Ligand binder design. Structure first.
Ligand SMILES: OC[C@@H]1O[C@@H](O[C@@H]2[C@@H](O)[C@H](O[C@@H]3CO[C@H](O)[C@H](O)[C@H]3O)OC[C@H]2O[C@@H]2OC[C@@H](O)[C@H](O)[C@H]2O)[C@H](O)[C@H]1O
Ligand SMILES: O[C@@H]1[C@@H](O)[C@H](O[C@@H]2CO[C@@H](O[C@@H]3CO[C@@H](O)[C@H](O)[C@H]3O)[C@H](O)[C@H]2O)OC[C@H]1O
Ligand SMILES: [Cl-]
Ligand SMILES: [Cl-]
Ligand SMILES: [Mg+2]
Length: 351
Protein backbone atom coordinates (compact mmCIF):
# COMPACT_ATOMS: atom_id res chain seq x y z
CA UNK A 1 0.00 0.00 0.00
CA UNK A 2 1.00 3.68 0.37
CA UNK A 3 3.41 5.54 2.59
CA UNK A 4 0.93 6.05 5.38
CA UNK A 5 0.40 2.28 5.62
CA UNK A 6 4.09 1.39 5.38
CA UNK A 7 4.82 3.78 8.25
CA UNK A 8 1.71 3.05 10.32
CA UNK A 9 3.60 1.72 13.36
CA UNK A 10 6.04 4.67 13.29
CA UNK A 11 4.23 7.97 12.67
CA UNK A 12 1.66 9.80 10.60
CA UNK A 13 2.61 10.65 7.01
CA UNK A 14 1.20 14.04 5.99
CA UNK A 15 1.05 16.57 3.19
CA UNK A 16 0.37 20.31 2.92
CA UNK A 17 -2.55 20.94 0.58
CA UNK A 18 -3.11 24.19 -1.27
CA UNK A 19 -6.60 25.55 -1.93
CA UNK A 20 -6.83 24.04 -5.44
CA UNK A 21 -6.08 20.53 -4.16
CA UNK A 22 -8.28 20.78 -1.06
CA UNK A 23 -11.30 21.70 -3.20
CA UNK A 24 -11.59 17.98 -4.07
CA UNK A 25 -12.00 18.72 -7.78
CA UNK A 26 -8.89 16.72 -8.74
CA UNK A 27 -9.86 13.03 -8.71
CA UNK A 28 -6.29 11.85 -9.41
CA UNK A 29 -4.97 13.72 -6.40
CA UNK A 30 -7.93 12.67 -4.24
CA UNK A 31 -7.02 9.08 -5.03
CA UNK A 32 -3.29 9.60 -4.42
CA UNK A 33 -3.74 11.53 -1.17
CA UNK A 34 -6.14 8.98 0.35
CA UNK A 35 -3.70 6.20 -0.57
CA UNK A 36 -0.52 7.87 0.66
CA UNK A 37 -1.24 10.30 3.49
CA UNK A 38 -3.13 10.11 6.76
CA UNK A 39 -2.48 13.74 7.83
CA UNK A 40 -2.91 17.08 6.06
CA UNK A 41 -2.02 20.73 6.75
CA UNK A 42 -3.49 23.76 4.95
CA UNK A 43 -0.73 25.39 2.91
CA UNK A 44 -2.06 28.96 3.15
CA UNK A 45 -5.81 29.24 3.77
CA UNK A 46 -5.74 29.43 7.60
CA UNK A 47 -3.03 32.10 7.74
CA UNK A 48 -4.33 35.33 9.26
CA UNK A 49 -3.74 37.57 6.22
CA UNK A 50 -5.19 34.97 3.80
CA UNK A 51 -8.30 34.06 5.80
CA UNK A 52 -9.06 37.70 6.70
CA UNK A 53 -8.74 40.98 4.88
CA UNK A 54 -7.02 44.13 6.16
CA UNK A 55 -10.30 45.23 7.80
CA UNK A 56 -10.43 41.98 9.80
CA UNK A 57 -13.28 40.53 7.74
CA UNK A 58 -13.38 36.76 7.45
CA UNK A 59 -13.96 34.56 4.41
CA UNK A 60 -14.18 30.86 5.23
CA UNK A 61 -14.47 29.39 1.70
CA UNK A 62 -11.06 27.73 1.45
CA UNK A 63 -10.54 26.93 5.14
CA UNK A 64 -13.91 25.20 5.30
CA UNK A 65 -13.14 23.30 2.07
CA UNK A 66 -9.89 22.07 3.62
CA UNK A 67 -11.64 20.83 6.74
CA UNK A 68 -14.37 19.24 4.63
CA UNK A 69 -11.66 17.41 2.65
CA UNK A 70 -9.95 16.03 5.75
CA UNK A 71 -13.31 15.08 7.24
CA UNK A 72 -14.40 13.33 4.03
CA UNK A 73 -11.19 11.26 3.88
CA UNK A 74 -10.79 10.76 7.67
CA UNK A 75 -7.41 12.48 7.73
CA UNK A 76 -5.64 13.90 10.80
CA UNK A 77 -5.65 17.68 10.35
CA UNK A 78 -3.14 20.26 11.54
CA UNK A 79 -4.21 23.91 11.74
CA UNK A 80 -1.52 26.25 10.40
CA UNK A 81 -0.98 28.74 11.97
CA UNK A 82 -2.54 30.96 14.66
CA UNK A 83 0.22 33.43 15.47
CA UNK A 84 3.00 34.20 12.99
CA UNK A 85 4.75 37.33 11.66
CA UNK A 86 4.34 36.46 7.96
CA UNK A 87 1.27 36.57 5.71
CA UNK A 88 -0.49 38.95 8.09
CA UNK A 89 -1.65 42.51 7.47
CA UNK A 90 0.34 45.34 9.00
CA UNK A 91 -3.09 46.70 9.98
CA UNK A 92 -3.20 44.10 12.75
CA UNK A 93 -0.30 45.87 14.47
CA UNK A 94 -0.22 49.43 13.23
CA UNK A 95 -2.27 52.52 12.84
CA UNK A 96 -2.41 53.83 9.32
CA UNK A 97 0.30 56.38 10.26
CA UNK A 98 2.74 53.57 11.05
CA UNK A 99 2.58 53.74 14.83
CA UNK A 100 2.10 50.59 16.86
CA UNK A 101 -1.15 49.92 18.70
CA UNK A 102 -1.09 49.16 22.44
CA UNK A 103 -0.33 45.73 23.86
CA UNK A 104 -3.94 45.64 25.17
CA UNK A 105 -5.40 46.39 21.74
CA UNK A 106 -3.29 43.70 20.13
CA UNK A 107 -4.17 41.21 22.90
CA UNK A 108 -7.84 41.80 22.10
CA UNK A 109 -7.23 41.04 18.45
CA UNK A 110 -5.35 37.83 19.32
CA UNK A 111 -8.20 36.75 21.61
CA UNK A 112 -10.78 37.29 18.84
CA UNK A 113 -8.64 35.59 16.22
CA UNK A 114 -7.86 32.48 18.21
CA UNK A 115 -11.34 32.14 19.78
CA UNK A 116 -12.92 32.40 16.34
CA UNK A 117 -10.50 30.29 14.30
CA UNK A 118 -9.64 27.56 16.79
CA UNK A 119 -13.25 27.64 17.96
CA UNK A 120 -14.72 27.04 14.53
CA UNK A 121 -12.72 23.86 14.06
CA UNK A 122 -12.63 22.68 17.71
CA UNK A 123 -12.44 18.91 17.71
CA UNK A 124 -12.09 18.72 13.94
CA UNK A 125 -8.43 19.77 13.80
CA UNK A 126 -6.35 17.42 15.97
CA UNK A 127 -3.40 19.77 16.25
CA UNK A 128 -2.45 23.41 15.85
CA UNK A 129 0.71 25.29 14.99
CA UNK A 130 -0.06 27.90 17.63
CA UNK A 131 3.09 29.97 17.12
CA UNK A 132 5.42 29.78 14.07
CA UNK A 133 8.99 31.06 13.76
CA UNK A 134 9.50 33.11 16.92
CA UNK A 135 13.30 32.73 17.14
CA UNK A 136 15.25 34.94 14.76
CA UNK A 137 18.02 33.87 12.39
CA UNK A 138 20.42 35.70 14.79
CA UNK A 139 19.32 33.41 17.69
CA UNK A 140 17.60 36.20 19.59
CA UNK A 141 13.80 36.42 19.74
CA UNK A 142 12.54 37.38 16.31
CA UNK A 143 12.02 41.15 16.13
CA UNK A 144 8.46 40.91 14.77
CA UNK A 145 5.60 43.29 15.52
CA UNK A 146 4.10 40.56 17.74
CA UNK A 147 7.23 40.53 19.87
CA UNK A 148 7.98 44.25 19.80
CA UNK A 149 4.44 44.99 21.06
CA UNK A 150 3.77 42.12 23.48
CA UNK A 151 7.10 40.57 24.43
CA UNK A 152 7.09 36.84 25.08
CA UNK A 153 3.48 37.09 26.25
CA UNK A 154 2.59 36.90 22.54
CA UNK A 155 3.61 33.23 22.70
CA UNK A 156 2.46 32.43 26.23
CA UNK A 157 -0.97 33.99 25.65
CA UNK A 158 -1.44 32.33 22.22
CA UNK A 159 -0.96 28.84 23.67
CA UNK A 160 -3.09 29.62 26.72
CA UNK A 161 -5.93 30.89 24.51
CA UNK A 162 -5.73 27.97 22.06
CA UNK A 163 -5.80 25.56 25.01
CA UNK A 164 -8.92 27.27 26.43
CA UNK A 165 -10.69 27.21 23.08
CA UNK A 166 -9.90 23.56 22.21
CA UNK A 167 -8.58 21.72 25.23
CA UNK A 168 -8.21 18.53 23.15
CA UNK A 169 -5.94 20.05 20.45
CA UNK A 170 -2.27 19.04 20.36
CA UNK A 171 -0.57 22.42 20.52
CA UNK A 172 2.75 22.93 18.76
CA UNK A 173 5.51 25.43 18.38
CA UNK A 174 6.89 25.25 14.80
CA UNK A 175 10.15 26.60 13.30
CA UNK A 176 12.79 26.21 10.56
CA UNK A 177 16.57 25.70 10.99
CA UNK A 178 16.02 24.32 14.49
CA UNK A 179 17.75 21.24 13.04
CA UNK A 180 20.96 23.28 13.46
CA UNK A 181 23.31 23.97 16.33
CA UNK A 182 22.67 27.51 17.59
CA UNK A 183 18.99 27.93 16.81
CA UNK A 184 18.29 24.50 18.31
CA UNK A 185 19.58 25.54 21.72
CA UNK A 186 17.99 29.01 21.59
CA UNK A 187 14.64 27.30 20.95
CA UNK A 188 15.17 24.80 23.76
CA UNK A 189 15.87 27.67 26.15
CA UNK A 190 12.80 29.65 25.10
CA UNK A 191 10.43 26.68 25.34
CA UNK A 192 11.95 25.57 28.66
CA UNK A 193 11.27 28.97 30.18
CA UNK A 194 7.68 29.09 28.88
CA UNK A 195 7.03 25.57 30.15
CA UNK A 196 8.00 26.50 33.70
CA UNK A 197 5.63 29.46 33.36
CA UNK A 198 3.02 26.70 32.85
CA UNK A 199 2.39 27.33 29.15
CA UNK A 200 0.37 24.47 27.66
CA UNK A 201 2.40 22.95 24.85
CA UNK A 202 2.34 19.38 23.63
CA UNK A 203 4.46 19.24 20.51
CA UNK A 204 7.46 20.66 18.74
CA UNK A 205 7.46 21.07 14.95
CA UNK A 206 10.77 20.91 13.10
CA UNK A 207 9.95 22.23 9.64
CA UNK A 208 12.57 20.16 7.80
CA UNK A 209 13.17 22.49 4.87
CA UNK A 210 16.34 20.65 3.92
CA UNK A 211 19.00 21.07 1.26
CA UNK A 212 20.17 18.14 -0.85
CA UNK A 213 23.41 18.14 1.23
CA UNK A 214 22.87 20.23 4.41
CA UNK A 215 22.11 19.94 7.20
CA UNK A 216 23.71 16.61 8.08
CA UNK A 217 21.72 13.77 9.67
CA UNK A 218 23.80 14.17 12.85
CA UNK A 219 22.48 17.69 13.40
CA UNK A 220 18.87 16.70 12.81
CA UNK A 221 19.39 13.85 15.26
CA UNK A 222 20.60 16.20 18.02
CA UNK A 223 17.42 18.22 17.55
CA UNK A 224 15.05 15.23 17.73
CA UNK A 225 16.73 14.17 20.97
CA UNK A 226 16.87 17.66 22.51
CA UNK A 227 13.24 18.54 21.82
CA UNK A 228 12.01 15.13 22.98
CA UNK A 229 13.82 15.82 26.30
CA UNK A 230 11.44 18.77 26.84
CA UNK A 231 8.63 16.19 27.16
CA UNK A 232 7.23 17.18 23.78
CA UNK A 233 6.17 15.10 20.84
CA UNK A 234 8.36 15.81 17.81
CA UNK A 235 6.83 16.45 14.40
CA UNK A 236 8.51 17.03 11.07
CA UNK A 237 6.09 19.49 9.54
CA UNK A 238 7.21 20.97 6.21
CA UNK A 239 9.59 18.46 4.63
CA UNK A 240 11.18 19.11 1.29
CA UNK A 241 14.66 18.83 -0.19
CA UNK A 242 15.94 21.78 -2.24
CA UNK A 243 18.02 20.36 -5.16
CA UNK A 244 18.82 23.71 -6.86
CA UNK A 245 21.92 25.90 -6.60
CA UNK A 246 21.90 27.63 -3.23
CA UNK A 247 21.94 31.36 -2.61
CA UNK A 248 22.22 31.01 1.17
CA UNK A 249 26.05 31.22 1.38
CA UNK A 250 27.09 33.73 -1.30
CA UNK A 251 29.67 36.56 -1.16
CA UNK A 252 28.64 39.96 0.19
CA UNK A 253 28.59 41.58 -3.27
CA UNK A 254 25.68 39.28 -4.17
CA UNK A 255 23.65 39.75 -0.96
CA UNK A 256 20.80 41.61 -2.71
CA UNK A 257 21.07 40.22 -6.26
CA UNK A 258 21.17 36.59 -5.15
CA UNK A 259 17.35 36.43 -5.10
CA UNK A 260 17.22 37.51 -8.75
CA UNK A 261 16.56 34.91 -11.40
CA UNK A 262 19.67 33.82 -13.30
CA UNK A 263 19.75 30.88 -15.75
CA UNK A 264 22.74 29.19 -14.05
CA UNK A 265 20.78 29.02 -10.79
CA UNK A 266 17.98 27.16 -12.60
CA UNK A 267 19.84 24.31 -14.31
CA UNK A 268 17.11 21.65 -14.54
CA UNK A 269 14.26 23.23 -16.50
CA UNK A 270 14.31 20.31 -18.94
CA UNK A 271 14.13 17.65 -16.20
CA UNK A 272 16.04 16.36 -13.18
CA UNK A 273 18.78 14.02 -14.38
CA UNK A 274 18.91 10.47 -13.07
CA UNK A 275 22.14 11.18 -11.16
CA UNK A 276 20.33 13.88 -9.16
CA UNK A 277 17.30 11.64 -8.73
CA UNK A 278 19.72 9.16 -7.15
CA UNK A 279 21.15 11.81 -4.79
CA UNK A 280 17.69 12.99 -3.85
CA UNK A 281 16.58 9.38 -3.17
CA UNK A 282 19.61 8.72 -0.98
CA UNK A 283 19.04 11.98 0.92
CA UNK A 284 15.39 11.12 1.66
CA UNK A 285 16.40 7.56 2.58
CA UNK A 286 18.99 8.83 5.06
CA UNK A 287 16.40 11.13 6.57
CA UNK A 288 13.75 8.47 7.02
CA UNK A 289 16.28 6.01 8.43
CA UNK A 290 16.84 8.58 11.15
CA UNK A 291 13.10 9.04 11.65
CA UNK A 292 12.63 5.29 12.00
CA UNK A 293 15.47 5.16 14.50
CA UNK A 294 13.69 7.77 16.64
CA UNK A 295 10.11 6.72 15.86
CA UNK A 296 9.41 6.61 19.62
CA UNK A 297 9.91 10.41 19.73
CA UNK A 298 8.18 11.35 16.48
CA UNK A 299 4.43 11.64 15.89
CA UNK A 300 4.41 12.74 12.22
CA UNK A 301 6.35 13.50 9.07
CA UNK A 302 4.51 15.95 6.81
CA UNK A 303 5.81 16.99 3.38
CA UNK A 304 5.29 20.60 2.27
CA UNK A 305 3.29 19.58 -0.79
CA UNK A 306 2.37 16.43 -2.67
CA UNK A 307 4.04 16.83 -6.08
CA UNK A 308 6.85 18.95 -7.48
CA UNK A 309 4.57 21.14 -9.64
CA UNK A 310 2.99 22.58 -6.46
CA UNK A 311 6.13 23.14 -4.39
CA UNK A 312 6.79 26.56 -2.89
CA UNK A 313 10.48 26.01 -3.71
CA UNK A 314 9.75 26.60 -7.39
CA UNK A 315 9.20 30.23 -6.40
CA UNK A 316 11.31 30.60 -3.24
CA UNK A 317 13.84 31.91 -2.73
CA UNK A 318 14.10 32.70 -6.46
CA UNK A 319 10.90 33.21 -8.47
CA UNK A 320 10.20 30.98 -11.49
CA UNK A 321 12.66 28.13 -10.94
CA UNK A 322 12.02 24.44 -11.62
CA UNK A 323 12.69 22.57 -8.38
CA UNK A 324 12.16 18.87 -7.57
CA UNK A 325 11.71 18.74 -3.77
CA UNK A 326 8.99 16.16 -3.12
CA UNK A 327 8.11 12.47 -3.57
CA UNK A 328 5.88 12.77 -6.65
CA UNK A 329 6.81 14.37 -9.95
CA UNK A 330 4.86 16.84 -12.12
CA UNK A 331 2.83 13.98 -13.61
CA UNK A 332 2.04 12.69 -10.09
CA UNK A 333 4.27 9.65 -10.57
CA UNK A 334 6.37 8.40 -7.66
CA UNK A 335 10.04 9.41 -7.81
CA UNK A 336 12.89 7.10 -6.90
CA UNK A 337 12.94 8.58 -3.37
CA UNK A 338 9.38 7.27 -2.81
CA UNK A 339 10.40 3.66 -3.51
CA UNK A 340 13.43 3.92 -1.19
CA UNK A 341 11.10 5.11 1.59
CA UNK A 342 8.76 2.18 0.99
CA UNK A 343 11.53 -0.39 1.05
CA UNK A 344 12.95 0.84 4.35
CA UNK A 345 9.73 -0.48 5.86
CA UNK A 346 8.96 -3.42 3.56
CA UNK A 347 12.37 -4.92 4.30
CA UNK A 348 12.67 -3.94 7.97
CA UNK A 349 13.97 -6.75 10.21
CA UNK A 350 12.11 -7.75 13.41
CA UNK A 351 12.04 -10.84 15.61
O1 LIG B 1 4.92 30.36 -4.99
C1 LIG B 1 3.50 30.11 -5.08
C2 LIG B 1 2.93 30.00 -3.67
O2 LIG B 1 3.68 29.06 -2.91
C3 LIG B 1 2.78 28.30 -2.11
O3 LIG B 1 2.62 28.94 -0.93
C4 LIG B 1 3.63 29.34 -0.05
C5 LIG B 1 3.65 28.40 1.15
O4 LIG B 1 4.04 27.10 0.77
C6 LIG B 1 4.57 28.92 2.21
O5 LIG B 1 4.48 28.05 3.36
C7 LIG B 1 5.47 28.30 4.32
C8 LIG B 1 6.73 27.51 4.00
O6 LIG B 1 7.68 27.79 5.03
C9 LIG B 1 7.28 27.41 6.29
O7 LIG B 1 7.22 26.00 6.36
C10 LIG B 1 5.97 28.03 6.72
O8 LIG B 1 5.52 27.44 7.93
C11 LIG B 1 4.91 27.81 5.66
O9 LIG B 1 3.71 28.52 5.99
O10 LIG B 1 4.20 30.18 2.57
C12 LIG B 1 4.33 31.11 1.51
C13 LIG B 1 3.38 30.78 0.37
O11 LIG B 1 3.67 31.61 -0.74
C14 LIG B 1 2.86 32.78 -0.78
O12 LIG B 1 1.63 32.45 -1.25
C15 LIG B 1 0.78 33.58 -1.41
C16 LIG B 1 1.42 34.53 -2.41
O13 LIG B 1 0.58 35.64 -2.62
C17 LIG B 1 2.76 34.99 -1.87
O14 LIG B 1 3.42 35.84 -2.78
C18 LIG B 1 3.61 33.76 -1.65
O15 LIG B 1 4.82 34.12 -1.00
C19 LIG B 1 1.55 28.17 -2.97
O16 LIG B 1 1.75 27.11 -3.92
C20 LIG B 1 1.48 29.52 -3.66
O17 LIG B 1 0.66 30.44 -2.92
O1 LIG C 1 9.74 32.61 5.07
C1 LIG C 1 10.46 31.58 5.70
C2 LIG C 1 11.77 31.44 4.95
O2 LIG C 1 12.48 32.64 5.17
C3 LIG C 1 12.54 30.27 5.47
O3 LIG C 1 13.74 30.24 4.69
C4 LIG C 1 14.74 29.43 5.26
C5 LIG C 1 16.01 30.25 5.46
O4 LIG C 1 17.13 29.43 5.74
C6 LIG C 1 17.39 28.40 4.90
O5 LIG C 1 18.40 27.53 5.44
C7 LIG C 1 19.69 27.79 4.94
C8 LIG C 1 20.17 26.67 4.01
O6 LIG C 1 21.51 26.93 3.63
C9 LIG C 1 22.36 26.89 4.69
O7 LIG C 1 23.70 26.92 4.23
C10 LIG C 1 22.06 28.06 5.59
O8 LIG C 1 22.96 28.11 6.68
C11 LIG C 1 20.65 27.87 6.12
O9 LIG C 1 20.28 28.95 6.95
C12 LIG C 1 16.18 27.52 4.69
O10 LIG C 1 16.44 26.53 3.72
C13 LIG C 1 14.99 28.33 4.25
O11 LIG C 1 13.84 27.51 4.15
O12 LIG C 1 11.82 29.12 5.37
C14 LIG C 1 10.60 29.13 6.10
C15 LIG C 1 9.70 30.27 5.63
O13 LIG C 1 8.54 30.39 6.42
CL1 LIG D 1 -3.18 27.86 -1.13
CL1 LIG E 1 20.78 17.97 -16.52
MG1 LIG F 1 -13.27 14.71 12.56
Amino acid sequence: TGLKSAYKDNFLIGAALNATIASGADERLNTLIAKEFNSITPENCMKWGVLRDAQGQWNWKDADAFVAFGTKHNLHMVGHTLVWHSQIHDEVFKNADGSYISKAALQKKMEEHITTLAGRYKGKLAAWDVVNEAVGDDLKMRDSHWYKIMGDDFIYNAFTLANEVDPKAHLMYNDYNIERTGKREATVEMIERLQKRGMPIHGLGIQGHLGIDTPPIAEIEKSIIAFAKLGLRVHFTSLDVDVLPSVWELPVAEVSTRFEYKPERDPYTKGLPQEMQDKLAKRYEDLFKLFIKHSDKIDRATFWGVSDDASWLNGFPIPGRTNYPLLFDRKLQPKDAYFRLLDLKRLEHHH
